[PDB]
Amino acid sequence: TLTFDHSLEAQWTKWKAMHNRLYGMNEEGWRRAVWEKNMKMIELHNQEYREGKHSFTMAMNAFGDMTSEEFRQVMNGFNRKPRKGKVFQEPLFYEAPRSVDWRKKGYVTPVKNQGQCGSSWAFSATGALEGQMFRKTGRLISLSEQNLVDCSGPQGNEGCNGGYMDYAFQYVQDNGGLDSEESYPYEATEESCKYNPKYSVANDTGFVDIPKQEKALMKAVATVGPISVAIDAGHESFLFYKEGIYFEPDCSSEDLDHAVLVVGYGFESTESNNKYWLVKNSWGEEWGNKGYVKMAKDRRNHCGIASLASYPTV
Ligand SMILES: [Cl-]
Ligand SMILES: [Cl-]
Ligand SMILES: [Cl-]
Ligand code: NA
Ligand code: NA
Ligand code: NA
Ligand code: NA
Ligand code: NA
Incomplete structure (x- = not known):
């Protein structure tokens, strides 16, 4: 699912290396879209946390590019x-x-x-x-x-x-x-x-x-x-x-x-x-x-x- 926030590129490259991920071209694209959606979900949650709207924070981890199965x-x-x-x-x-x-x-x-x-x-x-x-x-x-x-x-x-x-x-x-x-x-x-x-x-x-x-x-x-x-x-x-x-x-x-x-x-x-x-x-x-x-x-x-x-x- 092309279109990416390239300000996340350094974090995506590091994340893939830390989690032993290597994709071909088609899989790279949609896996990166899943991960970016989660990154932004986490970042928004934590921003909301800093405004006293949740009791806990979130963080990217080894599940960041996973599908439902x-x-x-x-x-x-x-x-x-x-x-x-x-x-x-x-x-x-x-x-x-x-x-x-x-x-x-x-x-x-x-x-x-x-x-x-x-x-x-x-x-x-x-x-x-x-x-x-x-x-x-x-x-x-x-x-x-x-x-x-x-x-x-x-x-x-x-x-x-x-x-x-x-x-x-x-x-x-x-x-x-x-x-x-x-x-x-x-x-x-x-x-x-x-x-x-x-x-x-x-x-x-x-x-x-x-x-x-x-x-x-x-x-x-x-x-x-x-x-x-x-x-x-x-x-x-x-x-x-x-x-x-x-x-x-x-x-x-x-x-x-x-x-x-x-x-x-x-x-x-x-x-x-x-x-x-x-x-x-x-x-x-x-x-x-x-x-x-x-x-x-x-x-x-x-x-x-x-x-x-x-x-x-x-
Ligand atoms: Cl009981
Ligand atoms: Cl103690
Ligand atoms: Cl022990
Ligand atoms: Na944030
Ligand atoms: Na924390
Ligand atoms: Na902390
Ligand atoms: Na012990
Ligand atoms: Na362990």
């Missing part, structure tokens, strides 16, 4: 049977703190990147299990999402098409283990099961589903550790989120399409609409705030953060 590959197809897990019982007399950050306590591995594969359910599951294994042993070991992708078909998952964290937790229970990231590295595609129990570094005894309430989620995060959740991530504002508390008016509490990990919660030093969930994504460190997003908290289950929350028991 490519976005869908980074979105979870999810097949929602009744949930089955044990029900989380709120500890009434535990006093949850005003702020939690499990990263700072050693529960959380570095940010990963699911690539062009609908495997966020697997990253969410490994993140929750990484946290529970650490709480149990004091050993932080990155776990194999590829193991889950290749092997948990029987439990109901569909590899890069999508899956559920509870199905992943069920697989680890049935299977008696899960291999380490180091032994079973991630390939961003579905392949034959290669689980080797000699390299298993995790186990689980089941899983717990949290009631669909932000209060219950807050108490779960405070008392358990990181929690697997699913959200409505299907908006440009999230795809190119940079910093701040994310609040998207068009967000749904019911229609979820992407799994993430809640590792904490807190508040901004200004005035209470100032609370947030601390959320680890699986879109690499280039996305968001070094791979993290602050999601609006206590704003009527914004983006469904409490609608599909669970954790494994170990």
Whole structure:
């Protein structure tokens, strides 16, 4: 789609080089038009942010030239049977703190990147299990999402098409283990099961589903550790989120399409609409705030953060 703002040429050339992009002549043209449309969308949003019209900023990242089909590959197809897990019982007399950050306590591995594969359910599951294994042993070991992708078909998952964290937790229970990231590295595609129990570094005894309430989620995060959740991530504002508390008016509490990990919660030093969930994504460190997003908290289950929350028991 020819016609380009050539004042973006230097940024476009740099962006292509930073993201290993090289196009023939026809593809160069329309990819550049998609990227420029997004650049201008981001720049306008941020201008509006500087005028106090949004709670968060946006930034160009690795999604800048993608088409709809490519976005869908980074979105979870999810097949929602009744949930089955044990029900989380709120500890009434535990006093949850005003702020939690499990990263700072050693529960959380570095940010990963699911690539062009609908495997966020697997990253969410490994993140929750990484946290529970650490709480149990004091050993932080990155776990194999590829193991889950290749092997948990029987439990109901569909590899890069999508899956559920509870199905992943069920697989680890049935299977008696899960291999380490180091032994079973991630390939961003579905392949034959290669689980080797000699390299298993995790186990689980089941899983717990949290009631669909932000209060219950807050108490779960405070008392358990990181929690697997699913959200409505299907908006440009999230795809190119940079910093701040994310609040998207068009967000749904019911229609979820992407799994993430809640590792904490807190508040901004200004005035209470100032609370947030601390959320680890699986879109690499280039996305968001070094791979993290602050999601609006206590704003009527914004983006469904409490609608599909669970954790494994170990
Ligand atoms: Cl600190
Ligand atoms: Cl450690
Ligand atoms: Cl509920
Ligand atoms: Na601007
Ligand atoms: Na640690
Ligand atoms: Na990464
Ligand atoms: Na910013
Ligand atoms: Na900034």
